[PDB]
Swiss-Prot record, chain A:
TM stretches of this protein: none
Residues of the full protein shown: 349 to 447 of 447
Recorded coiled-coil stretches: none
Subunit structure: Binds to the ATPase domain of HSP/HSP70 chaperones. Binds PRKN. Interacts with HSPA8 and JPH2.
Taxonomic source organism: Homo sapiens (Human)
Domain of life: Eukaryota
UniProt comment concerning the protein's domains: The fifth BAG domain is responsible for the interaction with HSP70 nucleotide-binding domain.
Disease: Cardiomyopathy, dilated, 2F: A form of dilated cardiomyopathy, a disorder characterized by ventricular dilation and impaired systolic function, resulting in congestive heart failure and arrhythmia. Patients are at risk of premature death. CMD2F is an autosomal recessive, early-onset form.
Protein name: BAG family molecular chaperone regulator 5
UniProtKB/Swiss-Prot annotation, chain B:
Gene label: HSPA1A
Expression triggers: By heat shock.
Subunit relationships: Component of the CatSper complex. Identified in a IGF2BP1-dependent mRNP granule complex containing untranslated mRNAs. Interacts with CHCHD3, DNAJC7, IRAK1BP1, PPP5C and TSC2. Interacts with TERT; the interaction occurs in the absence of the RNA component, TERC, and dissociates once the TERT complex has formed. Interacts with TRIM5 (via B30.2/SPRY domain). Interacts with METTL21A. Interacts with DNAAF2. Interacts with PRKN. Interacts with FOXP3. Interacts with NOD2; the interaction enhances NOD2 stability. Interacts with DNAJC9 (via J domain).
Main location: cytoplasm
Portion held of the full protein: 1 to 383 of 641
Residue positions binding ATP: 14-17, 73, 204-206, 270-277, 341-344
Protein name: Heat shock 70 kDa protein 1A
Any one of the GO CC terms: extracellular region
Residues the record lists as N6-acetyllysine modifications: 79, 110, 248, 350
Native source species: Homo sapiens (Human)
Phenotypic consequence of residue 201 to A: Reduces affinity for ADP
Record-listed N-acetylalanine modification sites: 4
Family: Belongs to the heat shock protein 70 family.
Amino acid sequence: KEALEKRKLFACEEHPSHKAVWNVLGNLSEIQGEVLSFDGNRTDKNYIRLEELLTKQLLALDAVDPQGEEKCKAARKQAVRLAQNILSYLDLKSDEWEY
Amino acid sequence: FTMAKAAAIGIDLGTTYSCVGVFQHGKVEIIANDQGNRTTPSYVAFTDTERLIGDAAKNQVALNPQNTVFDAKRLIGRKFGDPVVQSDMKHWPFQVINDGDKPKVQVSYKGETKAFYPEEISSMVLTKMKEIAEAYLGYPVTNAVITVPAYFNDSQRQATKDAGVIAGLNVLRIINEPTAAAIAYGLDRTGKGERNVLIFDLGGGTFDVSILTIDDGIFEVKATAGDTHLGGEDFDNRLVNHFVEEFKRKHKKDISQNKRAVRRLRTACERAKRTLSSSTQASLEIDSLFEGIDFYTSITRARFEELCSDLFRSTLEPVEKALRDAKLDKAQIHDLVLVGGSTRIPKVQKLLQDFFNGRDLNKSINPDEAVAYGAAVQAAILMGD
C-alpha cells in the first residue's frame, strides 16, 4: 500500500544523525522499562540514576548535527521530546505534595 | 610483545585530571585509559558495593556527591590549621575532618564509615595511572617521575612522594610542572646558554604563571603567581549567564531554576566555547529547552570575548606580578610556554603574545598533556634514556 516512512521519530535515514538517533532510541527504550516499573519518590536511588541517565540521552541528542536535512532535524527533536516524555512520567509517579 | 621494555613512566598528578606518559622505542606516548581517554579525572568515589577512581567516579558523581572525593591535591601536605583548607572547606560536598591537625576526607564506604588522608586518595589516583600504563605496556611498571606545582613546599612534595610509594611506585623524582613543560619543549636543549622561561598554565579552574631560568641543566624558579580560582569554568558561566538572560528577553521566562535545562545549556555552551577557539562564530541550538520552547540562537567570538573581557584581562596581572617578583622586564623573557586546556582560547593567546611584543608561543604540544610529556622524558633520562 504505502511504503513512505513518515514517522517523525524514525524518519531520519542519512548517515551521521541516523545512527546516533537510533542509538538513543534503544537507550531510551531500555531506560523507559526501568521507569515504567519504578516505585519511589524523588529521593530514591533509582529516581536519581534514571533521571541523570535520561539526561545523558538528552545530551547525546544535543550533540547531533542533522546537517540541515528535515527528516533528521525532526527525528532528533522527536527523540528529545520522547525522552522528556519519559522524564515527565518519572516525575509524575514520584512527585509528592508540598503542603 | 616487546623485548626492550620501558624503564619508567611520567605522571602529571593534576588537581582535576591526571595524565601518564611513557618514553619507549625512542618516543613518548601519552597512555589512554580503559575508556580510551588520554586523561583520567582525579576522582575517587566510595559506593556501598565498591570503590571507583577516574572516569567511573566522575560519571556517578551526581548520584553520590557525598562520597565522591576529588581535589585532594588542594589538601595534600597541608595542615588542618592551614588557611586554604578552611576556605576550600565546605565548598566540597564531601566531609573534610581533622586528626592531629592532619586533614582527612570523611566518606561512607560500604555501609560503615571511612576516612583517608589526602596522600591516600592520591595514591589511589596514582594506582589507576600505574595500572593504565601497565595495561598498555603489557608488563609491571614501578619507576616514575611525578610532577607538582612549583609553589609546593617540602611537606607538600613529600606527601606527593609518600602518595606514590603507597601505590607501589619507586619515585625517581618529584619535579615542577613548569619544569616538565619546559622539558617537553626542549627549552633546556638549546645552546644559547641562559634562558628566562615563562610558563602560562591556564586550566579549568586553576591559573598558574611561572618564570624559570634555565642554564646548564639547572631550572631555577624565579617567581610564581596566579589565580587560585580562575579557569575555563568561568568562561563557561558567562556564556551560560549570557544565554539564560537572552532566553528571558525573548521568552520572558527564567530557566535558571530548571536544573535539567541549565545542564543542557551549559553543555551546549562548553561546546560553543570550543568551537569559538577555531571559528569566529558558534551556533547554539537545543530542541525543546524549556516548556517545549526551542532555543536556536548563536554568538560571535567577539561577543564571547566581550562577555569575558575582564576575566581575560586578569590573565595578564599574574604575568606582571611574576615579572616584578623576578626583577625581570618583559623583554628579558626568552621563551613562553602554554599549558592548560583553556590556553586554547584565541584571545588568551593574543593577549599573551601582544604583551610580549609578538614573541612566538610554544603551544603545539597538547596543553593538557605537555606536563605528562615532560615528566616521561625526565623519567627516561633518569633511567639512562
